[PDB]
Design a protein around this nucleic acid. Sequence first.
DNA 1: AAACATTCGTTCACGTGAGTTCCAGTACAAGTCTGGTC
Length: 70
Amino acid sequence: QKGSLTIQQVNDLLDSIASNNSAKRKDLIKKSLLQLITQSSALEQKWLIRMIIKDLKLGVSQQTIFSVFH
DNA sequence: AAACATTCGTTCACGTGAGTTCCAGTACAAGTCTGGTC
């Protein structure tokens, strides 16, 4: 029900997965995905899946997000 | 002295133009779904 992974750890795992895909290492990417699954909740894993697919369906335009940021 | 008109004077109903609120329709930007090839 409660996860324990921080944003920095998630970003590091995602970068490791990207390098693994570029490095032709299936075992390492599988291990990273297993760690992500075992150290996250249902909602966290759903959001991770959405981010991986690169389709969040937030409903807020990119320009609105950028304007809010600056 | 009585009747008519006239007049006339009024006032009420109806019609037209300008300001305000609301909503339908249109233009533009972005998200989202989908097509094929190497």
